[PDB]
Each structure stands twice: as structure tokens, then as C-alpha cells.
């Protein structure tokens, strides 16, 4: 996060850290959606142009963290994955279309003050909150600069109008994507960055007071560059693939 602030304790209890066993290192963020299921960007697991092809055995999931590098004894829960599923039509060759993956935990995690799931939008939530102008929140332990936080950072950012998103890049934007950020004129900054990838873009429902994950930090061009924006996977448009894997 570039231009973010320190998260407060228990502000994002659904935030997960994707961690590499050896060499031990922060891979990406993810979010807890239930006691056994974690959601993240597919490019965190599989990205052939960079020789990235991570297996289940290769990682850990860390829940309830605040500190980026400390082992938060008695607070944090570290788990092992039972299974990884990537979207069958994920596009790593052209634009990262369908950048989404589910992780099945080898065993359920217990809820607590610091560990708690986020809601998945249903058609009417998405219809109402996914509006140009409406702010969402991104959290993560990534780079502070296009620079490593000591603690979980946060930033609130506006969703931008489809056309402005298209016009900012040469990359082919699909319907499973949405971009968010400040216009260079709005004179406000902030953005995901190296390490944040795969984390959540959440909004709070004005109707029931619940937090909903609307996007997944997917890609960008630099970090907090003027006139460029962050691209996020549209969780609702991929909602049936989600239900499907969980239910089968």
C-alpha cells in the first residue's frame, strides 16, 4: 500500500498472509471467507512467465496477523492447505482475466477477536455498492513504494468509471475487472503495491452494516503512478464458480 495508514488492531480480521515455507517470505495477501476457505489472486500461485507455479505443499496461510514479520504468539494461526483450485479460464497469457483461486485449509480455523470472515456479495449488494465514486478499502503488507511496512497498512480508494479505466492503459480490460484510485486531479494518492496482490477490496454495506469483499487486488502498472489505476477481480461476476467449488 502506497499512501496508506497503519491498520488498527482487529480492523480486518479476514486478512490472510500467503507465506512461503522456504525461503520463508511473504508471497501475497488473501482473505478468509469461512473457517476452511481462503480467497486470493490466481497469479499468486500460477504465473508461468516468471516460473511461478506454487503447489499446496509449498505454502502456509497465516491468519490474525498485524505484524508483517513477527510470529504473533497466541494471536495468529498458521495453516496448511489441503487443496488449491485456480479458475479454469484464468488468463495469464494476455491480461490476468479471472485472476481468482480458492485454498482449502487442511483444518478449520477457530474464529476469535482477530480472526473472522468477510461476506461475499449477493447480486443486490454488488448492484448497489459497485458504483463509480463509492469508496472501498484495500489492506496488505506490500511495498510502501513503487519500503516494507512494519504493520498491516490500509487505504480507502474510489471506484473509477469503466472508460477512464480503459483509457489509462493498453491492456485489454474485461467485465471480470474494475479499477479503483484517485484522478491525478483529485490530488489524493494511495494504491496496492508489490506484496499486496491477492488481498481484499472490501466495502461496508450501508443496509446491514456488514463488510463485503467486492474485489481481489489483481494488477497495476507501477504503484501510485499518476493517471494509472489498480485493477481488481470482480468477485461477484465470479460468484458461481466460487459456490460451485465449495458445494462440490
Amino acid at each position: 500500500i502506497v499512501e496508506g495508514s497503519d491498520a488498527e488492531i482487529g480492523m480486518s480480521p479476514w486478512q490472510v498472509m500467503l507465506f512461503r515455507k522456504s525461503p520463508q517470505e511473504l508471497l501475497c495477501g488473501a482473505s478468509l471467507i469461512s473457517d476452511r476457505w481462503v480467497l486470493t489472486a490466481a497469479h499468486c500461485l500460477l504465473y508461468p512467465p516468471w516460473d511461478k507455479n506454487f503447489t499446496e505443499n509449498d505454502l502456509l496461510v497465516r491468519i490474525g496477523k498485524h505484524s508483517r514479520t513477527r510470529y504473533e504468539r497466541n494471536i495468529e494461526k498458521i495453516s496448511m492447505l489441503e487443496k488449491i483450485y485456480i479458475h479454469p479460464r484464468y488468463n495469464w497469457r494476455e491480461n490476468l482475466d479471472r485472476d481468482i483461486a480458492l485454498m482449502k485449509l487442511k483444518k478449520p480455523v477457530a474464529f476469535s477477536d482477530y480472526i473472522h470472515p468477510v461476506c461475499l456479495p449477493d447480486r443486490e449488494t454488488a448492484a448497489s455498492l459497485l458504483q463509480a465514486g463509492y469508496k472501498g478499502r484495500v489492506t496488505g503488507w506490500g511495498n510502501l513504494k513503487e519500503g516494507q511496512p512494519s504493520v498491516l497498512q490500509v487505504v480507502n480508494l474510489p471506484i473509477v468509471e469503466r472508460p477512464v479505466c480503459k483509457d489509462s492503459t493498453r491492456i485489454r480490460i474485461t467485465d471480470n475487472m474494475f479499477c479503483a484510485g484517485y484522478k491525478p486531479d483529485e490530488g489524493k494518492r494511495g494504491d496496492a503495491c508489490e506484496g499486496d496482490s491477492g488481498g481484499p477490496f472490501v466495502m461496508k454495506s450501508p443496509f446491514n452494516n456488514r463488510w463485503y469483499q467486492m474485489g481481489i487486488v489483481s494488477w497495476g502498472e507501477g504503484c501510485d503512478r499518476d493517471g494509472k489505476y489498480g485493477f481488481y477481480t470482480h468477485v461477484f461476476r465470479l460468484k458461481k464458480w466460487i459456490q460451485k467449488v465449495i458445494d462440490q
Partner: peptide
């Protein structure tokens, strides 16, 4: 029990910038 945070929503406390979100949903 999704999206109700134990230290915020559950105890009826607001985080320091949530307001900026709600203020934007006009």
C-alpha cells in the same frame, strides 16, 4: 456471522476511517 468484526461491529465501535466510506455512498 460474516463481516461483523468482533472489536468493531459486535461492540458497536467504529474504526477510524470507515466514515469516509459511508459518506461516499452518497
Amino acid at each position: 456471522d460474516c463481516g461483523l468484526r468482533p472489536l468493531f461491529e459486535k461492540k458497536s465501535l467504529e474504526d477510524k476511517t470507515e466514515r469516509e466510506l459511508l459518506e461516499s455512498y452518497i
